[PDB]
Symmetry: C3
Subunit: 331 residues, 3 copies
Amino acid sequence: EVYGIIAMQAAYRDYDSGDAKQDDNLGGMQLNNESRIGFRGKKQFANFEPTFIWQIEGGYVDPSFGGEGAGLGERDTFVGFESASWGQVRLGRVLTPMYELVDWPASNPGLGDVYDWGGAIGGAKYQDRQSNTIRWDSPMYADKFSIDAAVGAGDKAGLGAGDDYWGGIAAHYKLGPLQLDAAYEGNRNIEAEGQTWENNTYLVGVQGWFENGISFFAQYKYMEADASNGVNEKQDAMSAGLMYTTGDWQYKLGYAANFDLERDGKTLSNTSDDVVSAQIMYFVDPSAVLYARARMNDFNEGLDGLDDAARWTSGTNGDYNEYSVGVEYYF
Amino acid sequence: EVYGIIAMQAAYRDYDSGDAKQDDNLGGMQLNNESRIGFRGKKQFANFEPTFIWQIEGGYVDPSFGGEGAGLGERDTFVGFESASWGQVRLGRVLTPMYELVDWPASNPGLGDVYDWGGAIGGAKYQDRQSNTIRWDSPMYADKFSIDAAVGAGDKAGLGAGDDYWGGIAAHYKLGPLQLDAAYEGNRNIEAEGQTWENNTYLVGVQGWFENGISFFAQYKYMEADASNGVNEKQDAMSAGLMYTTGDWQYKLGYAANFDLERDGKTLSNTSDDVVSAQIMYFVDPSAVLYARARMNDFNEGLDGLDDAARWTSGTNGDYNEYSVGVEYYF
Amino acid sequence: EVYGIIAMQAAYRDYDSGDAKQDDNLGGMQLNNESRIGFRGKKQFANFEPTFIWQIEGGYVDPSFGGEGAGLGERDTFVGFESASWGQVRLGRVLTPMYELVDWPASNPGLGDVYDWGGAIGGAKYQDRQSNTIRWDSPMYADKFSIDAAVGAGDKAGLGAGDDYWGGIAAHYKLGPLQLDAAYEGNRNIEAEGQTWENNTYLVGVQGWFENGISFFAQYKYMEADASNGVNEKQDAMSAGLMYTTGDWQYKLGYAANFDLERDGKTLSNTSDDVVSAQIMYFVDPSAVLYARARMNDFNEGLDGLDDAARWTSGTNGDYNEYSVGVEYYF
Ligand SMILES: CN(C)c1ccc(O)c2c1C[C@H]1C[C@H]3[C@H](N(C)C)C(O)=C(C(N)=O)C(=O)[C@@]3(O)C(O)=C1C2=O
Ligand code: NA
Ligand code: NA
Ligand code: NA
Ligand code: NA
Ligand code: NA
Ligand code: NA
Ligand code: NA
Ligand code: NA
């Protein structure tokens, strides 16, 4: 079976970097086509109660700031097995258990630049998608409690350039209208800035959906990282979102911020990031949505990594504002 | 819906460059797989009168002179809307309105090296299908008249490397068997040769299809460009094609030519290009065609760009001939 | 038509190279997703007795040691015709007639590092999958005898950088439970190491499958190579595999070896490669298998090419073992 996600977002961006040549480059209007075609299926093996499942999901066809074309298997592409009793284990390229919650709901109205990859910490906080991964998903115990857990190979280790590895776990309990989320992910042997890093990261979160139309999510992310030369670094962040949903409309407010980074006890001045964003959404069909959105990004003023050389952060390109309309269709 | 165009052309090329190694390198027999798979569909959003449309079309899987594999969304990939009333707007990656007339009536059979990208002029004449584009296509007004119009971001601006942009318009009037086609396209902020260019291009053409089987097309293309240091360049070109169709056959003769280029009024000697080409075609099935064709390309002798360094044109590889057979199947 | 081949292998590799960082990078566990999706079809042209056939096959979605994503048309992508009379001609990118016998049955389980792309011979022993190729596949005459024959442009010539080319032929006669296999493939205008080479390669082999559950294959590969400065090189190799089948199980044991390389009559010390492997395979569904395997590679100790600079072989990364389970599913 084929399954598309059609996704077009028209987005004009107003950059303020302090260089007007750079400002005109990064700023201006673009089309962020995140449409993707994928294939997936199951087959009942004649000699195996676990149901064989597989999926190949292609990439974004024409993202903004990027070229055209995407191969197959750039997004969640995997084989795995599933039994009703013990859930489903997948091998391949998946989302780590912590990353799922940083994406949804914690990056929801365009906050990702800050809560997703917007970091000041060294090493490697957590992982987007890693293509050398085993991941077990628990069933819904009592249809209320669920465990997600995974281990995998690192970014460099998946190309025979290193021995990066990582593991992570998260759990979700659905208390009536509530849902509580916690998550951990640790990376080892992260080669960066001329040192080898170990990153430990923990996430706490909550979610509610109430008949009056209010929905919300709030999350605390605690990011520690220890370098092999004995340096310590610590940063933490939050993301929350308030939304009212009436009829075929949803109004949404999101705020995310990393706070100042502490290195070796000493705090680094003005290294925090903050994003505010607002979003209207129309439920134009059971299968698709139209939406408008605007956001405000204030980024850090810089950070040197443990190699006398500057470290890259989501803010290394400068502050910017952004207004956008988009459509997204599911089939 | 899945929709292929299966397309193979076996094409031997006899190059005359003035270096027999390059002639042996560039020449010889090759296989030009231009097949492509795409996915496309429409959807009537339950809460919206315009019908939603989308398409993701992959690239040439193994072109000649190139490697294998092409992602999805390398060709016409877009989302958009249509109502009978006001026509059809699509956003994403499309063909500019002038390029449609450069490609369809005017670049086949093999005239492309000359009429398509083969210009000798500086700056950036027009666009061969650019992403970051919105394009509105009108209805057939009075069942005689149709207008195509679109604007979009430049090549560099689509990666945050500049601020080039462009707009273009074309119209089509149908007098009996004839059709008159006119089109304009202008590009701005084109960063090239160390200067910034503004290129305006104007196209007039006609096409006819007659009950006796005689058909033809003829087109005049006018190309302007203004560099930021005050330099001006002007070059013009033509492409015409004649075809007789009897039974299951179409015979075709094609001629296209870029003419001599003027810089600051002074014309630069030997910068013209012209191609001659013949093509026999058999309609092996309603869904496919077989064709044999031979063409002969004579190219320009060189010109420096406005940075003392030679500029690249379709003739920078030297003159060449080419004989070819091919198949084309549509599903 | 769409057709998957879903294929995942979890494979731990233990390298011994003589530098333990290289051992740590290259070694370790990885996920080798060799899943691939393709499209193929046939069409009876209304004015043409040969049946039109076509296929577009994507690449490996996430191989081990490599990144994600593969375009469409990285594997067998072709157009062609088939008649009951004369068999089947295909144009495009296919497997050469010799490489088919080097892959099946002679390279699995895990013998490819030595028998497939493994080698010490200069120039280019053979071609594995080649674009710009026409290949005629004969029928099974008398339901026992068939010819495979193909010629095409070289690797470098398909990008307009040279004129290397090649042809090849193989035959298979089926004497009862055995099948006798012979094959040749010759390459010309192969530029390497500052010389131009002509590569000749010959393969003879046998295959048997018995109701007793015993099945086997053995193959001898003869590779000669002659350089433009008058050097001669010769290397030869062998691969065999013995397997027993009980119920839904297949036991398999494999061995392959390239022998020491001869250059200009004088043999070059410690240039042989040998790999041995054992594998259990379960037939979990008519269309799928589970399998475990372990293998041992001892590779050569180095060889300077005809330019005083080392030549690359499958052993330029060092000896290693590998233990792995995997899955394999069809369409
Ligand atoms: C000056 N210019 C930008 C350069 C510089 C270096 C290059 O190596 C090349 C170009 C032009 C481009 C034009 C492009 C064009 N492009 C896809 C829009 C193009 O349409 C073709 C084509 N065969 O259709 C090219 O030859 C082309 O791929 C090409 O071979 C180029 C090329 O090789
Ligand atoms: Na990653
Ligand atoms: Na789960
Ligand atoms: Na090619
Ligand atoms: Na362009
Ligand atoms: Na139109
Ligand atoms: Na821009
Ligand atoms: Na090859
Ligand atoms: Na055959």
